[PDB]
Write a protein that binds this ligand. Sequence first.
Ligand SMILES: COc1cc(-c2cc3n(c(=N)c2C#N)CCc2cc4c(cc2-3)OCO4)ccc1OC(C)C
Ligand SMILES: [Pr+3]
Length: 361
Amino acid sequence: GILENLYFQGKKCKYSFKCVNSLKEDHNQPLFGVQFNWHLVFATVGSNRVTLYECHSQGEIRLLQSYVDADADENFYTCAWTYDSNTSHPLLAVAGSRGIIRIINPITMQCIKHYVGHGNAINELKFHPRDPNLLLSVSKDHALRLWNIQTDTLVAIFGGVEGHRDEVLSADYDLLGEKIMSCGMDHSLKLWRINSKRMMNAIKESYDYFISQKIHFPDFSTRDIHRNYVDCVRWLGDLILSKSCENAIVCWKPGKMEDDIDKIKPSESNVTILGRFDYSQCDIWYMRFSMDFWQKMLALGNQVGKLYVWDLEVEDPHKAKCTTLTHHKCGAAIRQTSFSRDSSILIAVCDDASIWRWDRL
Ligand SMILES: COc1cc(-c2cc3n(c(=N)c2C#N)CCc2cc4c(cc2-3)OCO4)ccc1OC(C)C
Ligand SMILES: [Pr+3]
């Protein structure tokens, strides 16, 4: 007790960041997304633009190239990075209000292919952590869709009888990509196992190319975590982090305290809430939080330009865990943050088209 506190305090050199740079995008429209390539370079999405930037020494943010959609009415809400499974060259998927996924070559910032589900707004994209070809999209039409971008096939549609009853806003794969947790405007969080016999066969068939699987039932469902819509969800090992508009990110897990995630049945009625990360003034819809590659840091921006950064490695609920980052010129809603794979740079993007670079010192 005393010994472990003396050890924690003695070494303590708390997460500290300093704003080194800031930019404003000429379009003046909100930036909804930002992602560093984890496969130095980051992409931003907003309006009908996808902009590629590179971080340099002396806190410089360098504009590289931009993809401008021919449809000026397109509003991209999300982007995700992958790589070509053969050439190892990077790829970027983007999507938004039109409901079209564009696969962009970031070297030349050109769309090389595109996919359409039912043409409904796409709220988030995520690539499978083990298969660079498997792309998950979540939609305003209440479904999640799994695409094979190597064979251009829609592997599966997650939705139906027991699928989401309203817009799906976010989803995340676990570390091995055996399961997906999704959340949305119907206030629920649903687990979908993609290592089931049915999904393993659908993925194999997709690689032999199409008849898509329609997965009507999740492997777990809950509306017991939040009393309002859930706009962001991420896996934290075998635990889940999710948030609503109640100024808290909730850490939880399906079942009772001792229940193993792989033994949870669809009929499971219990949820264990381990704790919350509290903050203020972030009660507007569609504000994402993010973690670094190694999942040791959690960050969320609020509707007034304040950034919150929590240390996930402090297990003691009493100890200092939260660092707040402000800049007098950053007064707009921070919609998403992204950490560099090295976890030394944190970028925040805003409603007034501004980009904020924070360097970890
Ligand atoms: C068509 O224009 C607008 C659209 C939105 C808007 C934003 C988002 N989603 C929407 N459904 C929507 C809508 N409708 C869903 C996906 C999402 C994810 C986000 C996010 C925002 C969004 O931030 C963090 O991750 C807001 C302002 C607009 O317009 C002004 C620029 C005039
Ligand atoms: Pr610890």
